[PDB]
Amino acid sequence: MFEARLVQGSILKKVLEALKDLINEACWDISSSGVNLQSMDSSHVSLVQLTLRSEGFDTYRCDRNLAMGVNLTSMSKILKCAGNEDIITLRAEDNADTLALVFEAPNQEKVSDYEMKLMDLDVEQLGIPEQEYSCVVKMPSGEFARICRDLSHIGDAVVISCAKDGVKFSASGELGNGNIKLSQTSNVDKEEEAVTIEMNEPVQLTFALRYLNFFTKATPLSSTVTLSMSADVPLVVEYKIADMGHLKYYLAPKIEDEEGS
Amino acid sequence: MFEARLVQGSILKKVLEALKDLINEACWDISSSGVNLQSMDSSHVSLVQLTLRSEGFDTYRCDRNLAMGVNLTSMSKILKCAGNEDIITLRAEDNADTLALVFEAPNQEKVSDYEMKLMDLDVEQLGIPEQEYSCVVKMPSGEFARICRDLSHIGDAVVISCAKDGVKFSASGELGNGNIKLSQTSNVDKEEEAVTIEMNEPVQLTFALRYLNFFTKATPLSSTVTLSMSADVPLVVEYKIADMGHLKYYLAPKIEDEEGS
Amino acid sequence: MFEARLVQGSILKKVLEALKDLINEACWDISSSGVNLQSMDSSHVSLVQLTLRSEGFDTYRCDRNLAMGVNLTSMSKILKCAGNEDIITLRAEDNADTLALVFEAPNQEKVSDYEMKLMDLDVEQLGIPEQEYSCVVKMPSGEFARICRDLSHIGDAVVISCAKDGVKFSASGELGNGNIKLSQTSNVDKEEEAVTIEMNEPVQLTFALRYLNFFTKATPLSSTVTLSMSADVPLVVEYKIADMGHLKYYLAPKIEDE
Amino acid sequence: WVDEFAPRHYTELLSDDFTNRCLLKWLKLWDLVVFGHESHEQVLEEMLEAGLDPSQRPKQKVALLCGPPGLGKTTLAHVIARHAGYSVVEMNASDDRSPEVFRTRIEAATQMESVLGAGGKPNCLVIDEIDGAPVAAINVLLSILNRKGLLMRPIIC
Amino acid sequence: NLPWVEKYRPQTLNDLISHQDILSTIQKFINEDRLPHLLLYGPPGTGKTSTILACAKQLYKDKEFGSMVLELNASDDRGIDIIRGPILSFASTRTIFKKGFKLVILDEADAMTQDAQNALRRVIEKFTENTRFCLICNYLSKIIPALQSRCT
């Protein structure tokens, strides 16, 4: 018997509006550590890794480990009928197939029990490497979301660079060239508006713009986002939820072969 | 000679967007009691009654009864022309083929005389039986609109169940069942959230979704909504708009399935 | 070399959103006086005269007089993701194919350098439009945009008439007849709301409503618009922005009068 | 219904060894660009050995496995792509009708630098029922083939 | 002034003649509220439209005849867009009027194709308790035997 009590529906709402245009079907692993979502997209390029800890929920109870799989657009439309100040009760049992979302409304008088039908897809678990990378940059999430929306217009795929100085965004689009470079943003009053460089080895890699745009729809979950780049292991975009868990997006590069000349 | 003056212009500018997509024309009937407007939808499912009494107007001049037929397509764009707190007047002659709507421009500088033609439409009054309703619910209006918007994401035909416990709005679609039940909201400070049940015998009626959305298009007219239903009587949605009169929506249920055992 | 830094980006974004469907390309003439843009439609229906003087910018540098024509929609994609309060850097070389926009849009020190290519168009010359307009009326701009939308709601063509009381608008159609009639309201606290009258020889004309909407999509650009019309001369709307320059729109009347 | 008797290695294929040998030769010919490693039968062996692209690519980049709809050509391509060091990412041209979602399933799904979590497991594209696809989709695939970014992953139609 | 057929059209079950067994059975079915989907077929001008209009004015009043009766005829092309168009949306709806079935008078039903008659067979079998169809036609043999097997 799996029962999770989300304290606020806003974080679930932002998680689902982040994952709405990326994943065909979402798989949840349920254990005493909490809930896990390690999955691929509809095109087998990106990876989603959502971890929700046990202490973040109001009441979290689980007897046996559960591997459920649900349609995602159906769950987006189910969660669309919900407020932002209501506790959310995810219910499932041992030997059935219905996922129940029970929450309050903004009237705070009426219960709302939305049933859903799961899927029977057996998905091989891909092992996350959990290795070190070549560059780690801490940056506020609104900056990354607005620069993804700003950089989607110039081109179709973008090359990003990180070095000892700071982070760099480049786009060789049909309109022309778009190049930004930001470093040493820590000299403000706010603690969110800060860019921190951790590692040494500079990296330049190109990625599709649409996957970055679908990654940046987790904007108000975390005030600060973490970007990890490496030459071999994929690009990591990590949103740290404050008292619930974390959410990582992994993005594979694209081919940019040099000219023969 | 018909002359009417409203106290605030926003009455028409909230009551005519509810008839923008629901009904195709307007049949104004003039009398010493005031103005009324009974229109059946083109699909003969939805019925709109609008009754504005003479005491709510600033001034009201009428001599004999008049039947008037107008087109709502241009009127639904002429509602965008007027302001929100201006003073509107309706003027109609005896033998003329055009009616005048005279008000002030939103600049508060310019007299606006908009002239609209009359469609000589041959319509007849149906005649409401006005039977004793088997269940009466007093509810908020924005709550009803957001619950119709909530069940617009599940199925195309909601189910209203009304028992002595209260009202249960349930939508079943290809996604999954979602039910919302209200009961006993008299313990609130404001008097507009008193979701009250006024009759004993339970009913269970299945209604269309787009029609209830077209009905809930009229939220800011009033604060509370009176929903009347019975075993075979259509759904009655009553709005006590300000002090000048009221509005009524009549909706036939959907055809039940052959679920005999 | 050419360089111009605008203090705020809302004016440029808003004027390029004003003429997003009016013209097909934007051609700036660069001199020591400022940025001149005189564009004419392909069907001889509307004309745009936008002047940005050099004193309105923080820095304006120009060596040689230039003429750059770029397809609007391409720069609409540039400034659809700009900022309301930001420093704008518009630059180009003397003989180059590129044009660069450098901005710090979200006040997050993100130096976004956007480059676009120049389109070599045919140089058509329109020297000076004749300005001997008998009927001049100053009117607030946002409510002028409001009543332009109001007249565009009901009809398809607007009959306009100056008179000693004011400016009367009308439109006709098979569902109704729209009509509005101005009155003098100089006794208000708002100086922008007052309508100023310099009109003689009243003239009745007709115009297309969509071009009026394309003109008056620049509502928040200036607090007071000016209308100038006369017999057989195209109607002018005019925004005098208080800092960097002015903007004028010309519309020729329809053949089927009244 | 092919539950445990499915082929998985190169020793379980049910085709003639010449066709499988030349198919494996064409699959391993891409190791110079993908991995970076340095009668009609004689015509095929000449065209598979003599002359290459300057970017270490073969002259042909698409294989047309024409034949009857049965006879297990898809399973053969699957086990050969498993044997050659790639991972099979299959796609279908019959459920894909719109060209926009076709380019999503082709130009936005594979044949880029799809460095996944398994760094030792690259991917290859297998397309079935290319005859029933609309002519816009095959014109799009022809434009992808004639793109000079460069196409590096093999296509097994 | 007016043609004699439009002047002296019969308006009563007794004013139509030689169909006395048919009119007796129709009156027997309509007094007991057991009227099925009807298929009136025969030569032109023998009293097909006027019989069902007399039965409609027996069932319904003058005010609700224009609301609970939909008439389609030779002016409407009878293909596959109509059966998924106005007649399906008419049959699949309730009315704010007294609790009785609707009525659809489809003139020249023999001009429908086999696919159109099968789609109409789906519409007829789906909605029965709230809609009673009336297909009137010249040739019985031009319609499918399934449609003959669901309407009297």
Ligand SMILES: Nc1ncnc2c1ncn2[C@@H]1O[C@H](COP(=O)(O)OP(=O)(O)OP(O)(O)=S)[C@@H](O)[C@H]1O
């Ligand atoms: N039984 C009848 N008694 C008297 N007049 C009749 C009778 N049947 C037909 N008529 C007359 O003939 C006209 C034609 O009748 P209708 O029923 O309208 O034609 P129909 O039988 O539907 O055949 P169609 O429409 O040409 S295929 C009526 O308007 C009457 O004037």
Ligand SMILES: [Mg+2]
């Ligand atoms: Mg007939």
